[model samples]
Target chain A: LKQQLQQAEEALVAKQEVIDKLKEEAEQHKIVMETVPVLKAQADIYKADFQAERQAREKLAEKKELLQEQL
Target chain B: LQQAEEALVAKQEVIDKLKEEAEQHKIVMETVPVLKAQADIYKADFQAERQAREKLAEKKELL
Candidate 1:
């Protein structure tokens, strides 16, 4: 029947749309997963730098104290 | 109309596939937040441990 064909066509179009949407979402998640490691690495580097800076300051303060005691 | 009916059947198959894909994505999305949170907690622990070590060293030097 002509009406049956029309209905089938409509269903096909709807299915294509769903496929496109799923593909888009999968790509989005892939991008997020890929970028997450990079962000975490950056954060780790910052933390290390912070620790190093703090240690350097502490050493400097100690040296200053020793010099003042000598004076 | 016959062709249209066939097309509709094809579309239904596609919709079913998409539904499966969506369920997979849901499982993945659920873990993403947990992974990020674990990384954050690890960072905090490392910072605390580093600070503690430095404090101990400083105390030893003073002694």
Candidate 2:
């Protein structure tokens, strides 16, 4: 009985290790999920800024050309 | 022998629970790569957008 109990306990320990590894992997996935939203937001911001910059550049070029013509 | 059987039964229950938890983790692991790929695409888009913005900024500054 003692020998059987020992074997059972050892098996349980092994399974516990497997559980631990799985938990670690799940946490990693959770981190990636959390990061996705932040990155998406950043992409949106970049897109908006790009649009704004293009408009600003066009306005600046027009002003520079007008000043050159005046001179 | 009876005690041994009882202990084995208890251990078996624990193993079943662990297996269930592992299955949940496996699902997450499988889904995350798809999400990670999406994030990668977003990252690339953002980088390209920012580069264009910077170039425009430089041109405006020169004027």
Candidate 3:
């Protein structure tokens, strides 16, 4: 009976360790999930800026052509 | 003994599921940085192009 109880205690400790590890991993997962969205939002902002810059470039190209023809 | 074995099995299953979830999140996090870097490069190139065009426009105006 004493041996059986000792074995049970050892198994419980091992199971608790697994639970602790999983808890830590879940926390990391939560942090990653939070961070990914912020990065995505930053990428979206940069994309919009890129589009605006392209449009400005197009307009400037047209203006420059007109100026060159006049010169 | 039997009950302890069953409990351990259940804990093992929970650990497996958590491991899978953590792996998925890790993949997603890794992808985010790569995409962010690409977007940053694209933005930098666009800004450079815009500056070059503006310089050309200035030259044309001076002429």
Candidate 4:
């Protein structure tokens, strides 16, 4: 019975690697989710600021009743 | 013989450690979706605020 050797050691290393990889992937997903949207929000704020300023400039150029008569 | 038996025991120990680590990692993985959902909520809030600001600016320009 002792003459035959089982190769279970190889299986153990394979399983450990699977577990380690899963842990690493989960952390990566968490980091990506946490950080990416704040960057997008910052970009969006800039866009909104630009649109508001453009509207204000147009409003300042309008000349009330005289502009309406010209229209 | 004896060496093979010792190797098998060491392998069993490694398997046990791996199983433990996998369970712990699973717990951490389980929290990721919840955190992601919260981030999605924050994104929605940002959109709403952006739209509200746009509406306010448009009304002021009408004045």
Candidate 5:
């Protein structure tokens, strides 16, 4: 029984470490997985502002083109 | 000797905790990939529109 216990202890020690690592890996993925929604929210706001600027850039682009032709 | 019982006690507790966390992790695993794919498409569309517009502005410059 003592010998069996020794063997069992070794196996359990390795198994516990593996499971512990798995738990941590899952935790890290859970953290990263949440950031996607946060990222989407930020990108959602930024793209609106992005096209707002793009609109102004278009006006400037037209001004320069007209000047190149007639000035 | 209760050595074998003692040996299993520690392992059983860890297994129970790990099993619970892993099941939920699979839920995230299923969801995250779909979200990632959608995010990729959204990102591409935003950049592609900007690129196409900027290119057209330059092409307008060309004429």
Candidate 6:
């Protein structure tokens, strides 16, 4: 019985250490879960803005070509 | 002693569950969108540089 109790206690101790480390890992992932989406949204907005900028530049080129053709 | 053995089994179960947590933690840390922004910036700069180059040529041709 004593030997079994000692074995169990050591097992629990080892498991507890791993659980603590695992909890930290889980929390970091939780932070990443929330963060990645927020960052993705930011990147999406940047992408949209970039698309609009390109389109506006295209419009400028179109106007320039029109002007050149008339002259 | 039997009680201790039962507790040990429960502890083992927790370790099994946490192993999955550890797996995704490794995954999300790598696949996050922060890296996506770099390529996004790269594309934007490319377009911006091209527009500048075009404007410079247009000005020189006009003069």
Q: Which model scores highest in TM-score?
A: 3
A1-71, model 6: which lDDT tens digit per residue? 47767877887788888888787867767876677776777667666766766665676666666667776
Model 5 lDDT per residue over B1-63, tens place:
265577577677777777786787677567666666666666666677567667656755555
lDDT string for model 4 (B1-63, tens) is 465556557656655676575566566556556655655655566556556545655544444
Supply the TM-score of chain A against the true chain A for every candidate structure: 0.84, 0.81, 0.90, 0.59, 0.70, 0.76
Instruction: State which candidate, 1 or 5, has the greater TM-score.
Output: 1
Clashing pairs in 6: none
TM-scores for candidates 1 onward, in order = 0.59, 0.55, 0.73, 0.52, 0.57, 0.70
For candidate 1, list the clashing residue pairs, or say none: A5-B1
What DockQ does each listed candidate score? 0.20, 0.23, 0.48, 0.10, 0.22, 0.36
Q: Give the per-residue lDDT of model 6 (tens digit) for B1-63.
A: 777677678877888888875785777768675557654784676568557646745743553
Native interface contacts kept by each candidate, as a fraction = 0.23, 0.19, 0.52, 0.05, 0.22, 0.29
Could you give candidate 1's per-residue lDDT for residues B1-63 as a string of tens digits?
A: 656666666666766887776677667567667667756765775567567656656644554
Docking class of 4: incorrect
- Decide which is better by TM-score, 3 or 5: 3
Indicate whether candidate 3 or candidate 6 has the larger lDDT.
3
Give me candidate 6's TM-score against the actual structure: 0.70
Candidate 1: CAPRI quality band: incorrect
- Highest lDDT: give the candidate number: 3
Candidate 5 residue pairs that clash: none
Candidate 4 runs further than 4 Å off = A1-3, A6-71
Which of candidates 1 and 2 is the stronger one according to lDDT?
1
Model 3 segments beyond 4 Å from truth? B1-6, B53-57, B60-63
Candidate 4 lDDT tens digits, A1-71: 52354454464456557556665755665665555456455446655655565555455445433444554
For this target, which candidate reaches the highest DockQ against the unseen true structure? 3
**Any runs in candidate 5 off by more than 4 Å, and if so which?**
A21-24, A42-71, B55-63
